[PDB]
Design a binder for these strands. Structure first.
Lengths: 61, 41, 94, 62, 51, 130
RNA sequence: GACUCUCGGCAACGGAUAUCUCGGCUCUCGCAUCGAUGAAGAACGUAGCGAAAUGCGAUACCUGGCCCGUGAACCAUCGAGUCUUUGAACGCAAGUUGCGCCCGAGGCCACUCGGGCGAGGGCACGCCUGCCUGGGCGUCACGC
RNA sequence: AACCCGGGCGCGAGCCCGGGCGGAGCGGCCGUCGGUGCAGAUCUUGGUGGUAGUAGCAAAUAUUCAAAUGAGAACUUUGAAGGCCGAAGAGGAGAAAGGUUCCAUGUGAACGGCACUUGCACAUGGGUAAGCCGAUCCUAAGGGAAGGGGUAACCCCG
RNA sequence: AGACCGAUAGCGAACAAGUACCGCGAGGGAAAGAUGAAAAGGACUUUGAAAAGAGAGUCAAAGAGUGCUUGAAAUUGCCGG
RNA sequence: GCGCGACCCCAGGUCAGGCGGGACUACCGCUGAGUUUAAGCAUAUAAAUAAGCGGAGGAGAAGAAACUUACAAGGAUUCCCC
């Protein structure tokens, strides 16, 4: 899953934040400053609960 | 570090000091590397 | 060989970068000094022989200032009075 | 209720316990107005303004 | 290497870059007054970046 | 220039203050002169208008027309009245904004609180009259 | 029977002239502080569409105190709150960011000995006043 | 009022009218104020003519024939033919520096010293993902923080 | 407030102004107002490489049509003597 | 020829309580030029200016006489007028 996050992020707080609010374990998180001014984060999830049907209830393309 | 990176004479592709070999496309233990001579003019 | 035409290309290297204190490209990085505000330097650079445009800038001008002024105009620090609720009420008399 | 809210006086006459459930509900719904930004509806306009105020009202009042 | 990395210049350069966009069709319309030639809008070839 | 201990005269500031107008000064721009029956029930020469009022066009080409006020704009104090429109080149029909000075209020939506102000101005104007 | 001189007509170009003035200039009265309880200087966010502007602040044109009774704001709002981050900038560093250590209630597992989450707080600008800590200075008590 | 054209008076500075235009302000007498009169000052600023459809768009000889697409094709794109680049007069990877110039789609007023369907021009979207690359930790000319003291003080040695 | 100035004047700045822009930096620094009573701010049709043009429509007025009041000069074209 | 507890001087820490360091346009307190003028120039003048520096307030600053005096009286101190 791919989120845009705050600029006083990390990877541990997002690995927690995603966990609370979407009920999923996340395995790694990858973090970028963007030409937006914003932080672009790619969040790789456990196969136990797949990004596809995690996503569907807040659909995203 | 004084080792800099090793750049391949065939492909010209840069691949470490710990990698033994190049591989940019099938370069594949062609061993045709020379290191960056470690900094000029 | 020589001056400007070749010496403009040589150049690549940097002295004046942004200051943290004033927000203006003027901080002389390897001589650790701002030629626009002083930094490091305890009190902010003001010279009063650099007269008209420069003096006004160094005063600054981008303030909140309304926010201080409204208190200054009030004087107090208290507010009670909560009038206009069904009865109604007590901003009229009788 | 099930419809959006609020008045200033209504929050004031709610307990600390009530208003934080209300603050809870509000972030959650706000969170919806973020995915509903992909939709781009005019309902997510009006509402994303007015929810912003309701958060500010709950935060001040507490 | 990175591609000079530091976040602290790098963000602010990216802010000026986001700030250098067109005015938004609307602000020409409601409008008070102007040939709205925005104007602080800066270019890859010409004049020169500042901090 | 002429008189009273107050803030204001003043040909530079007043022309600036009222053309771009701040709020109660914007509320004052919304005043339209009463019709005569209302003028003697509520005892006043002019009142701020409204939206379920009814208004007769005196000044313009529209002069003689009467209609309900659709909406009024604060920013550029103008009001739109029903059926006072002109048709755009495509043919769509657009309202024509009118200044309140041009119009006179035939009928008011009385309210109760705004009614209470009406009840207040009547009391005021009894002290000039008798 | 070319092309060319001078003046004019008609038009353009250009933006003088004349009036207008959401502005100054100047003179004058009034009034008069803001601060380490983070001012003032600046950053970058902040919108439906957001590049301007002024306005704000990681809460983000803030805001606290749809037409017949509590919406809106240089209506006055002599009214008060957030006030991120840098900035005197104060834990430390620094190209408006970052940083590693200590302390932590209350959830847990072992459910015995222990661990491990978590808000929040702390890490010489100087000086005074109250408390601890140590010799140095003249000594009393004391046995020799 | 202003402007343009002429008519009348005054040696005259200048006054006045008629026509057109313009579409709101304008005089006269007296008494006063004064940012009070230009052709000029290598005068300033702005505009504008001749210079002129003139100089430049010339040295690596670089394209040519078919074809695509297009309202439009010498210069966009395919193929063929033909060359040029060789420590890089035009290959690969990068430092600084730039600062989004990258990719895609859609355009074409300005640019490109010309055409332009094209583009590094314009507009809108999109892309950069680190336990094992680098930052980061160390320490080197030194920037130095730390007495005392000159110095009001800034500031400077230790 | 005014025997001030009135858009080359007055502040550098009537507007997006210490903006656009210049300089490594200290610092330097412009040009920039006015359709109309009301947007009524140019439908519909013909044409065209594009813009635009033609015709028509609105208004007292479009040589009032968008840096749109007036519209000099210097200048250009056409044209008349 | 001696150790100890206590008084008293100095020093470091500590948390507390309290204040101060920067700012606002000028006003408002030390150091301290030159062009210039004297048709030159060196004292003198420009000028105790400008500038630099420090620090205050809504105003500062100055104040109730070891004062004036030229008599014979006045009676803290600024400022205005001369």
């Amino acid at each position: 899953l791919v989120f845009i996050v705050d600029l006083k992020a990390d990877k541990k707080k997002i690995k927690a934040a995603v966990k609370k609010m979407y009920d999923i374990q996340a395995k790694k998180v990858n973090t970028l400053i963007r030409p937006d001014g914003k932080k672009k984060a790619y969040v790789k999830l456990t196969p136990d609960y797949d990004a596809l049907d995690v996503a569907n209830k807040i659909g995203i393309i | 570090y004084n080792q800099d990176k090793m750049i391949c004479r065939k492909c010209y592709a840069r691949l470490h000091p710990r990698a033994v070999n190049c591989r940019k496309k099938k370069c594949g233990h062609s061993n045709q590397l020379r290191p960056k001579k470690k900094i000029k003019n | 060989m020589g001056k400007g035409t070749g010496s403009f290309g040589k150049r690549r290297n940097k002295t004046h970068t942004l200051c943290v204190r004033c927000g203006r490209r003027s901080f002389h990085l390897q001589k650790s000094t701002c030629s626009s505000c002083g930094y490091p330097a305890a009190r902010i650079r003001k010279y009063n022989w650099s007269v008209k445009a420069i003096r006004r800038k160094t005063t600054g001008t981008g303030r909140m200032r309304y926010m201080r002024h409204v208190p200054r105009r009030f004087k107090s620090n208290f507010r009670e009075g909560t009038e206009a609720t069904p009865r109604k009420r007590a901003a009229a008399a009788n | 209720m099930s419809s959006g809210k609020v008045k200033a006086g209504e929050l004031w006459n709610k307990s600390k316990d009530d208003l934080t459930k209300q603050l809870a509900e509000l972030k959650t719904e706000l969170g919806q107005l973020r995915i509903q930004k992909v939709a781009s509806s005019g309902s997510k306009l009006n509402r994303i303004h007015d929810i912003r105020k309701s958060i500010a009202r709950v935060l001040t009042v507490i | 290497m990175p591609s000079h990395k530091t976040f602290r210049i790098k963000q602010k350069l990216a802010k000026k870059q986001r700030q250098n966009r067109p005015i938004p069709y609307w602000i020409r319309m409601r409008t008070d007054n102007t040939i709205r030639y925005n104007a602080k809008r800066r270019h890859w070839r010409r004049t020169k970046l500042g901090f | 220039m002429k008189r009273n201990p107050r803030v204001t005269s003043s040909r530079r500031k007043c022309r600036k203050a009222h053309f771009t107008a701040p709020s109660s000064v914007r509320r004052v721009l919304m005043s339209a002169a009463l019709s005569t029956e209302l003028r003697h029930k509520y005892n006043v020469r002019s009142i701020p208008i409204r939206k379920d009022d009814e208004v007769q066009v005196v000044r313009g080409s529209y002069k003689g027309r009467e209609g309900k006020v659709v909406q009024v704009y604060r920013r550029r104090w103008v009001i739109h009245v029903e059926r006072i429109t002109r048709e755009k080149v495509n043919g769509s029909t657009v309202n024509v904004g009118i200044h309140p000075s041009k119009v006179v209020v035939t009928k008011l939506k009385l309210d109760k609180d705004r009614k209470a102000i009406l009840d207040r101005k009547a009391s005021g104007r009894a002290a000039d009259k008798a």
